[PDB]
């Protein structure tokens, strides 16, 4: 029985070696998608959403680079596209993806002796790849995914400052 | 025995008939059943097509089935009667044959038939029954309203 859903049996592929494992796979994607591919995708989305959340919050608070538009994060995409300097953020993304994801993706698909998904060996400071720091990475990334989804769909809906709620801190704190 | 039995009603025979009747009587009953079904299917198809598509006779004959036949010339009726009579004398000779199988102008007792043949025969029979009811309904509607089937549906 899975630890997360106590009325279903966990898949055999999940086991307990992977970081962030909680037996949560009710519809068993792990049989139709390789777990390493799924983990690489999970970590990629998690990292992109962490960066997106912190960048959105910074730009909304007002942290702006010189010569850039002085706009909120909701209109920042359109403003940057109009002003021009937004393809040079795609260019490093282009080289990183084409020269690290495609080879790593084909290694995960084909090679048996390949690094696990989301492992680029990126440890400049040597902080450590412990299983505590992988669990923390995964938990923060999942929280950032949900938080970014909420932030975008609330900012577009309400068109308000940082809280992205209609009333403000009053909705997070009804006592106010 | 025969092929007519079907799922919705089973062997439908409330009023005897089948028992206490000769094999010749049973063959006559099935021949009449198949003839009625076939003629009724022809009548239903003819009425349905001639309601909205009647190019013959310069398109002047009415869509009413009970008046189109009145307007048809005498020679056409005589030729139709001659054709039907020729088909019926062939049926009579088939009856006189010693290996008659009620309704089977194809033979079909001289080939290795299986249950699919019986199923298709039942398909013919049930379509004939449905057409038997439908054609009489069409004629009664034409007499009552004066409109044909599709004109009534309009």
């Amino acid at each position: 029985k899975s630890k997360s859903i106590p009325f279903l049996e966990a898949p055999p592929a999940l086991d307990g070696t992977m970081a962030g494992d909680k037996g949560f796979d009710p519809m068993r994607l792990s049989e139709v998608v390789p777990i390493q591919w799924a983990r690489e995708a999970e970590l990629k989305h998690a990292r992109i959403c962490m960066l997106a959340v912190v960048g959105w919050v910074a730009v909304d608070l007002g942290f702006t680079v010189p010569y850039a538009p002085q706009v909120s994060s909701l209109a920042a995409h359109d403003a940057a596209v109009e002003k021009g300097a937004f393809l040079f953020l795609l260019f490093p993304i282009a080289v990183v993806e084409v020269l690290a994801g495609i080879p790593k993706c084909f290694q995960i698909m084909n090679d048996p002796n390949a690094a696990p998904g989301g492992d680029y060996k990126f440890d400049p400071l040597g902080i450590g790849a412990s299983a505590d720091m992988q669990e923390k990475e995964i938990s923060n990334g999942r929280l950032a995914m949900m938080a970014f989804s909420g932030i975008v769909t609330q900012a577009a809906l309400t068109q308000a400052p940082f809280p992205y709620t209609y009333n403000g801190m009053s909705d997070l704190v009804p006592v106010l | 025995d025969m092929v007519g039995a079907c799922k919705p009603l089973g062997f439908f025979d409330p009023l005897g008939f089948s028992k206490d009747a000769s094999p010749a009587s049973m063959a006559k009953f099935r021949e009449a059943e198949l003839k009625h079904g076939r003629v009724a299917m022809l009548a239903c198809a003819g009425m349905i097509t001639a309601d909205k598509f009647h190019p013959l006779y310069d398109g002047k004959l009415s869509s009413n089935p009970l008046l189109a036949i009145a307007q048809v010339p005498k020679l056409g009726l005589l030729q139709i009667l001659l054709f039907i009579g020729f088909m019926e004398v062939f049926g009579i000779l088939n009856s006189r044959r010693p290996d008659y199988k009620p309704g089977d102008f194809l033979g079909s007792s001289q080939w290795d038939t299986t249950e699919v043949w019986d199923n298709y025969q039942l398909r013919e029979l049930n379509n004939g029954r449905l057409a038997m009811f439908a054609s009489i309904g069409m004629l009664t509607h034409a007499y009552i309203t004066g409109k044909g089937p599709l004109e009534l549906l309009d």
Binding site: - | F90, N94, R97, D104, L106, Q110, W111, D112, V116
Partner: protein
């Protein structure tokens, strides 16, 4: 459920017992046509065939002839039918002469006397049928 089987239970004869070839309707119609009917003499076979063909031979010449739009359209059609029937029975006679060279049986289409009787019946029947069709088309106002 096979419906095409060997002809007369002979797989090695060049034929098949299809519904078209062997069905009861085909057997009845063919066997009851005059050329195959039982008990008919060769004269009677020829007579029936003759009237059947001479009745319809007039029509093409009458309607689609050169003198269709003429007062003598039907007479010309009948003369054309008579000429075609003359050619047909000449063909029949020479066919009998070529095929049934030596024969003494008679009363059989595959014999000289029987084929001569068949040709005679065909000639008389065709002339009579063409004449009857002429009379009917003259009195077409009846129908």
């Amino acid at each position: 459920s096979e419906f095409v089987k060997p002809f007369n239970n002979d797989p090695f004869v060049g034929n098949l017992s299809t519904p078209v070839t062997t069905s009861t309707a085909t057997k009845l119609y063919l066997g009851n046509l005059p050329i195959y009917r039982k008990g008919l003499s060769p004269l009677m076979r020829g007579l029936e065939v003759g009237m059947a063909h001479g009745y319809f031979l007039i029509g093409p010449f009458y309607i689609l002839g050169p003198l269709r739009n003429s007062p003598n359209a039907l007479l010309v059609g009948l003369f054309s039918a008579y000429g075609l029937i003359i050619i047909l029975t000449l063909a029949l006679t020479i066919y009998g002469l070529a095929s049934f060279q030596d024969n003494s049986t008679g009363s059989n289409l595959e014999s000289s006397k029987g084929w001569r009787s068949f040709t005679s019946g065909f000639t008389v029947g065709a002339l009579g049928g063409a004449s009857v069709a002429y009379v009917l088309l003259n009195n077409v106002s009846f129908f």
